[PDB]
């Protein structure tokens, strides 16, 4: 069967390999799957590379040869320097020979581009190993061979392109700093000869496939070569004329010219400025004559999506925006360059009408760059007056929903600038757009929404007087638009847009109380409308206006008998009678915003009392019944009522913060008693029904009560200003109600929200409750750790909140860990290292931070027994655990913090901050410094973990690492160099001197 190729005691049956390969690539189903596993096992055989010569010579399947080169690639990349020197020469020879022969056969060259490209990349892998030190003739001979054959010349452009990519574009993470610099300098040293070949090909035609490959390589060169190669030769003229006319070369040429626009160029040289103008002029001329005139409908062209039109229009946008963002000042003073400047921007206007989100964001970024400059730079805005006028319409017509959020903010930013640049033109465009809604020529739900977002987005730009007439005009026109429509589907859309606009102009509302009052009362009416969405709109608009105009609700206005907040509260039952609970909470939250602006404490608490009258009365009755009949909580309707009362308190506490304390005090004691009663019911249900009870609506409803209670307490404490009351009134009842219940429930019934609440308690008053913190640890530490230390996935919320809590305890009440018994402190260390190994960012980051903070906590204690025992017990544990995640290739997200932790650990010994020997006195001569022993320990650790490294590599790495432990950036470079070297054999130990 197919598995015969895995038997290397027999000659490789090439025909069988070709069958396996064919079955994989062209087959299907179960056969394809079996072949895939066979091929992977073949490829991974560490001796498979020996049979690559046979496959490349005798196979007739190009995919088989591709896999043969992948096998060689792995060998060259990872084990090249371990080979006998004869195999290195041999492999180089038959890779070169294979490429030569494929290029000499026009049919193979034509039809096996995939295999040739793969062979070229394999050659480049060899060059990275061997060149130039053991292949000095490569470039001179490459240039010579290019002249004898168009196919070889074209393929050499592919080799050079890949070489440039591997050395300059993709070297940072794949080779050491020293080796990258060596290859970069080697290419720079011989680029003069490379450019000469490249320019000769471009100048003398004439095979387009050869030209295209040459331009592809030039694109790569432009990333790094000095500008003189581009500005002291004729190449700009060729790029911006010759190669723009032919579509074959047009795409790559435009990309080259975009990168030319990014070259490092001296900006006080007049000749160079003229060259930069000139190639832009040439390029725009070629576009207008060979591709499309300035007037062309690029929106329609892009939508038709013929051939490569979309990529070309994308690339033209990139070219124009890139060049103009850097160089448009070159075109703004010379009157003979004005048409070029405006034609380029007119193309951008046309490109900005294309329906393509990501392209629009690219052009919008440029427009922002432009209008910001016109806003600040003297004497520029008049140049672009007609461009900006068109842009106003483009952005208005493409405004997206505010709350896509990012795009709205970017559009708003540009439109605000455009409004300052010409307030009159902006207003006229918007009024005119509104007229076309009323006359039906452009009426649609989407169209009126888009215009209302645009109108709302420029609030705060116009003068208050103009704004006032503007707002009046818009609302008048919008009211008329709503009146003329029928069906209530149409009237709903327009009424919402009316409310959206007024909500965006708080300055107008604050100046016209009678208007503001009328808006609110009409919002209250809409809170009774059943039409889908009207109620959410009314509540959203209400709190939005309140957040911006709160002062006008809390003072007594002229002609009024009382502050309007009193009037809202008087009628709250009626106003909110038809609202869903979530909407009621928003309404109450809005009222709390107003109440908190009342500076008189007695008035503020009175308003708070009146606001909470309905929830407090429902609360009092329930507490009276729940206490008399704990059975009533089995009623799902009572549970839902209780949860909504608490949620209402959460909502008001969210807006009032510290000022909420009197209401919290009204419910606090009965609320915690309810927490206990609900807790008993949850436990009783789990006991009677099993763990599945936690899935039931009844228990989920009960746990919602517990979670909302915790959220209410957490919300208040996070905002409290009187911390004496928190400690003396709130904390002890809280801990008594929550901690033992958490500890003594089965894991599936424990609420992670308990941990979250305790994190806030510790954060805010931890420094004042040392014994309370100890009690928190005793109740949650060991039992939570046991939930999360068997895998990385179970109990994901407990896992995250667990390390947040340890983090803050370690920050604010480190003494609580000092009190732990030794066995429990060991679990603490175990838990931290466990966090290191998480791929979960929400855990790994806190684990690395806890470790760092812990080391600093220990350091602060000075030379005392606890710190001395800590280092003796745990220093090398933290060193080796940090090294493990640094080097195992599965925790790259934490590299920076791992490096920081390791540097802190090493610098402790380097600074002699550990006052006791880290070794056992029987282990090394007495008096040996911890510095020496650290070097030995690390050398032995790395020799056993990475046995393929030479002793010299390890010693040089550690020598560099330890003297760089004060310079983080350099320290990290040395670690990255180490991560490169451990992936291969024979890394150069002198690489670690790169810094020096």
């Amino acid at each position: 069967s197919m598995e015969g190729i895995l038997d290397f005691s027999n000659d490789l049956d090439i025909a069988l390999l070709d069958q396996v390969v064919s079955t994989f690539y062209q087959g299907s189903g179960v056969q394809q799957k079996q072949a895939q596993e066979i091929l992977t096992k073949f490829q991974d055989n560490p001796d498979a590379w020996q049979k690559a010569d046979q496959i490349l010579q005798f196979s007739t399947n190009p995919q088989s040869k591709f896999i043969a080169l992948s096998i060689l690639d792995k060998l060259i990349t990872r084990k090249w320097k371990l080979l006998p020197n004869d195999h290195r020469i041999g492999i180089r020879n038959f890779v070169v020979g294979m490429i030569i022969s494929m290029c000499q056969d026009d049919e193979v060259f034509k039809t096996q581009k995939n295999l040739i490209n793969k062979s070229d990349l394999t050659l480049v892998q060899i060059l990275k190993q061997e060149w130039p030190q053991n292949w000095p003739e490569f470039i001179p001979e490459l240039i010579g061979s290019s002249s004898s054959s168009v196919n070889v010349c074209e393929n050499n452009m592919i080799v050079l392109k890949l070489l440039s990519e591997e050395v300059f574009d993709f070297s940072a993470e794949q080779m050491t700093q020293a080796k990258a610099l060596h290859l970069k300098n080697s290419m720079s040293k011989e680029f003069e000869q490379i450019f000469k070949l490249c320019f000769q090909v471009l100048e003398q035609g004439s095979s387009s496939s050869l030209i295209v490959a040459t331009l592809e390589s030039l694109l790569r060169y432009l990333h790094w070569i000095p500008y003189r190669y581009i500005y002291e030769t004729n190449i700009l003229e060729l790029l911006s004329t010759k190669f723009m006319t032919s579509p074959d070369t047009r795409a790559i040429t435009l990309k080259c010219l975009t990168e030319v626009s990014n070259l490092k160029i001296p900006q006080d040289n007049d000749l160079i400025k003229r060259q930069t103008v000139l190639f832009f002029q040439n390029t725009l001329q070629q576009i207008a004559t060979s591709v499309m005139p300035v007037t062309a409908d690029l929106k329609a062209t892009y939508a038709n999506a013929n051939g490569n039109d979309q990529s070309f229009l994308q690339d033209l946008a990139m070219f124009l925006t890139t060049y103009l963002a850097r160089n448009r000042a070159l075109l703004e003073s010379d009157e003979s360059l004005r048409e070029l400047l405006l034609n380029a921007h007119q193309y951008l206007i046309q490109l900005s009408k294309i329906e393509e989100r990501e392209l629009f964001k690219t052009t919008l970024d440029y427009w922002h760059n432009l209008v910001a400059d016109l806003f600040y730079e003297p004497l520029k805005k008049h140049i672009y007056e007609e461009i900006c006028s068109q842009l106003r319409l483009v952005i208005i017509e493409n405004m997206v929903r505010p709350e896509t959020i990012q795009l709205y903010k970017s559009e708003r930013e540009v439109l605000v600038y455009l409004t300052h640049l010409n307030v009159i033109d902006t207003e006229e465009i918007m009024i005119s757009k509104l007229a076309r809604q009323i006359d039906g020529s452009e009426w649609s739900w989407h169209n009126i929404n888009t215009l209302s977002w645009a109108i709302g987005s420029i609030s705060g730009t116009m003068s208050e007087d103009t704004e006032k007439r503007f707002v009046v005009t818009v609302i008048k026109d919008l009211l008329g638009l709503c009146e003329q429509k029928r069906g209530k589907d149409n009237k709903a859309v327009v009424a919402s847009d009316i409310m959206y606009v007024v909500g965006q102009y708080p300055r107008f509302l604050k100046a016209h109380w009678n208007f503001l009052r009328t808006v609110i009362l009409k919002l209250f009416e809409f809170m009774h409308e059943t039409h889908e969405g009207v109620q959410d709109m009314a509540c959203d608009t209400f709190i939005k206006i309140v957040q911006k105009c709160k002062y006008h609700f809390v003072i007594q206005q002229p002609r009024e008998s009382e502050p309007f907040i009193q009037t809202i509260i008087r009628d709250i039952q009626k106003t909110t009678a038809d609202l869903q609970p979530q909407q009621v909470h928003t309404f109450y939250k809005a009222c709390g915003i107003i109440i908190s602006e009342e500076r008189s404490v007695a008035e503020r608490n009175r308003l708070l009392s009146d606001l909470m009258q309905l929830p407090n009365m429902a609360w009092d009755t329930i507490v009276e019944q729940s206490t008399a009949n704990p059975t009533l909580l089995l009623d799902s309707e009572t549970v839902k009522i209780i949860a909504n009362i608490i949620k209402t308190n959460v909502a008001v506490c969210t807006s009032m913060g510290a000022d909420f304390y009197p209401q919290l005090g009204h419910i606090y004691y009965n609320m915690l008693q309810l927490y206990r009663a609900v807790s008993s019911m949850i436990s009783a249900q789990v006991a009677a029904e099993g763990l599945i009870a936690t899935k039931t609506p009844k228990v989920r409803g009960l746990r919602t009560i517990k979670k909302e209670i915790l959220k209410l307490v957490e919300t208040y404490i996070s905002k409290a200003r009187n911390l004496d009351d928190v400690v003396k009134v709130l904390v002890e009842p809280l801990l008594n109600a929550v901690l033992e219940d958490y500890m003594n429930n089965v894991p599936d019934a424990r609420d992670a929200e308990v941990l979250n609440c305790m994190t806030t308690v510790v954060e805010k008053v931890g420094h004042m409750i040392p014994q309370g913190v100890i009690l928190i640890l005793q109740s949650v530490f060991e039992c939570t750790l046991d939930m999360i230390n068997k895998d990385f996935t179970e109990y994901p919320e407990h896992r995250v909140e667990f390390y947040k809590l340890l983090k803050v305890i370690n920050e604010k009440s480190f003494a609580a860990f000092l009190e732990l018994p030794p066995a429990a402190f060991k679990l603490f260390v175990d838990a931290i290292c466990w966090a290191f190994k998480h791929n979960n960012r929400d855990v790994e980051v806190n684990g690395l931070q806890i470790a760092l903070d812990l080391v600093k906590n220990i350091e602060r204690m000075g030379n005392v027994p606890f710190a001395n025992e800590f280092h003796k017990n745990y220093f090398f544990i933290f060193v080796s655990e940090t090294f493990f995640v640094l080097t195992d290739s599965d925790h790259k997200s934490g590299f920076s913090k791992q490096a920081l932790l390791l540097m802190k650990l090493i610098s402790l010994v380097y600074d002699n901050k550990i006052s006791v020997p880290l070794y056992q006195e029987a282990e090394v001569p007495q008096g040996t410094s911890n510095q020496v022993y650290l070097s030995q320990y690390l050398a032995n650790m790395l020799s056993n973990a990475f046995p393929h490294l030479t002793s010299e590599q390890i010693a040089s790495f550690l020598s560099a690492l330890t003297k760089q432990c004060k310079d983080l950036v350099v320290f990290k470079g040395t670690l990255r160099d180490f991560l490169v070297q451990i992936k291969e054999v024979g890394g150069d130990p002198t690489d670690y001197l790169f810094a020096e």
């Binding site: 609302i475 009211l479 009424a495 009328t518 009409k522």
Partner: peptide, 11 residues
């Protein structure tokens, strides 16, 4: 300003 109020309420 006041002519809007009446129109506003009839929505």
């Amino acid at each position: 300003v006041e002519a809007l109020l009446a129109r506003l309420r009839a929505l």
